[PDB]
Amino acid sequence: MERASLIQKAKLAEQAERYEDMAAFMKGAVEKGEELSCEERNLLSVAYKNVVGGQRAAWRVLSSIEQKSNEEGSGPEVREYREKVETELQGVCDTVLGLLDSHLIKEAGDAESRVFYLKMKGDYYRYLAEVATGDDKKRIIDSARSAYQEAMDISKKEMPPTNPIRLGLALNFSVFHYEIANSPEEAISLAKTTFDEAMADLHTLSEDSYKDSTLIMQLLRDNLTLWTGSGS
Amino acid sequence: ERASLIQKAKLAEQAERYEDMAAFMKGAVEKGEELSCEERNLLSVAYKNVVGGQRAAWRVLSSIEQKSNEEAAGPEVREYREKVETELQGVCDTVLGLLDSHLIKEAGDAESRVFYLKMKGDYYRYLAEVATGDDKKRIIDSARSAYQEAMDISKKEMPPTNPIRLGLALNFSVFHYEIANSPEEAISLAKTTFDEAMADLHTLSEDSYKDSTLIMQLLRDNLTLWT
Numbered sequence: 513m514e515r516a517s518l519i520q521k522a523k524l525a526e527q528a529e530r531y532e533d534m535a536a537f538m539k540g541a542v543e544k545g546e547e548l549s550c551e552e553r554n555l556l557s558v559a560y561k562n563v564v565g566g567q568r569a570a571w572r573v574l575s576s577i578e579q580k581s582n583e584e585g586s587g588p589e590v591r592e593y594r595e596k597v598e599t600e601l602q603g604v605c606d607t608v609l610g611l612l613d614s615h616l617i618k619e620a621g622d623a624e625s626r627v628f629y630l631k632m633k634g635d636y637y638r639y640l641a642e643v644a645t646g647d648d649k650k651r652i653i654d655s656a657r658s659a660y661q662e663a664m665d666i667s668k669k670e671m672p673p674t675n676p677i678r679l680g681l682a683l684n685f686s687v688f689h690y691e692i693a694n695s696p697e698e699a700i701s702l703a704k705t706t707f708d709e710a711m712a713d714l715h716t717l718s719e720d721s722y723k724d725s726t727l728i729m730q731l732l733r734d735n736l737t738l739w740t741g742s743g744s
Numbered sequence: 745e746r747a748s749l750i751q752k753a754k755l756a757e758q759a760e761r762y763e764d765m766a767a768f769m770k771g772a773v774e775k776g777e778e779l780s781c782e783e784r785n786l787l788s789v790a791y792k793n794v795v796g797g798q799r800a801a802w803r804v805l806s807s808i809e810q811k812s813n814e815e816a817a818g819p820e821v822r823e824y825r826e827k828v829e830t831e832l833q834g835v836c837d838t839v840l841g842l843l844d845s846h847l848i849k850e851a852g853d854a855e856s857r858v859f860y861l862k863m864k865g866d867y868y869r870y871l872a873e874v875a876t877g878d879d880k881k882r883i884i885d886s887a888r889s890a891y892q893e894a895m896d897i898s899k900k901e902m903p904p905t906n907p908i909r910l911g912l913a914l915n916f917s918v919f920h921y922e923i924a925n926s927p928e929e930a931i932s933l934a935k936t937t938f939d940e941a942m943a944d945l946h947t948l949s950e951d952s953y954k955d956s957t958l959i960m961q962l963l964r965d966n967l968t969l970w971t
Binding site: 520524587597 | 751760804816823824
C-alpha cells in the first residue's frame, strides 16, 4: 500500500541520512490512520529527533553568540538569525505535537504505546520551553508537566518499575524538573526514587531486558552524580 | 544590506547550516560587488557542503538500485533516487547560473578569473556524475571547454607551484580519468603537473610550502592508485 511505500522510503531516507525526508514519509504514513508497530514508532521518533536535534544545537550556538556580545568587552543580525532558527524549530514541534494529538495518542490502544506517545508529547513541549520567553513560557512548561504526569500515572499502574519505557520517561521528567521547571530537589528525588524501585526489582528481570534497563539506570545515576557534586 | 548577508553567512558557517549559508552568499553575489578572497571561500564552502551531501546520498541510493536488480525491491528506490538527482541538478544549475551572470565576466585579475572558471568546470562535472542520456556528452563538453580556458589563463599567468593552478590541474585530470574515460590523458596531465611543480619547489616561501606540497600529495596518491 501507499503506506508500505512510505515506510520503505522512510527506511531508505534513514540510510541516506535525509532526516527531513524521513520525517515527511513517517508523517504521511501516520496520516494513513494505521497504528504504528514498534519498529515504525522508532522510525518516527528517529526522524523527528534528528531534525529537532540539529535545530536545537544551532539555536544554542546562536543564543550563546548573542549573549557573549551583550557582555563587557565585545549588530542586530545575530538576533534576526537566532529568531529564524527559533521559528523553524517551533514549526517542527507544533507539527509533532499536532500528530501526537491528531492522531497517535487517541488512536493507541495498549498502555506501552500510550506511554511512549505521552512521553514524546512531554519531550516536544519541553523543547518548545527551552526557547520560549514571554508569558507563554509558563503555559508551555505546564503542558509539558501534564503530558509527563499523565504518562507517569499510567506507567505506575500498568508497568513494572524495571520496564525500560517507564525508566526512560522518569529520566526525562526528572531532567525537565532540573533544567526547565528549575526544581532541582524534585529532579534529584524523582531520579533516586526511580532508581531504588527498579533496583529492588532487578532479580525479576529476564536476560535481554536487564541490559536495556541497567543502561537507563546508568543514565539516572549519572545525572544524580552530576546534580550532587562539584569539581576543582 | 550586503554587509548583513556576509555577516549572516559567517554565522551560518558556525551553526553548520550550509543551505542557509549558500542562500546568504547567493544574495550577496546578486548585489553585483566583486568577492574578496575571504568571500569567494565562503561561497565555495556554502555550495560545496550542500552538493557534497546530495552526491553522497545519490551514490548510496544508486548503489542500492543496482544491488536490487539481481534481482522489498519495487519502484520506490528509483522514485527516491530521481528525487535526490533532481534536487542536486537544481543546486548545480543555480551555481552555474550565477557563475555565468555574473562571476567570471565580473572578475578583473587572473587568480579570481581562474577560481571561477575552475568552479564552473567543477559544477558541470557534478552534473555529469548523474547524467547518462544524449545529455551526458554535451555536459562533459561544457565541463571540458571550461577547464581548457581555465588551463590557459593559469600556465601563462601563474608559477607551476601556485596552489590554485595545481588544484585546477588535479581536478581536470580527475575529469579525464573518471568522466571522459581518457585514463592516458589523466595520467599524463597529472605527472606533468607534478614534475613541473617539483622542479620549482626550492623557490617556494614557508606558508605556500605547506599548501602546494599537500596538493602534490593528492597527485602522487592518485597516480600510485590509478596505474
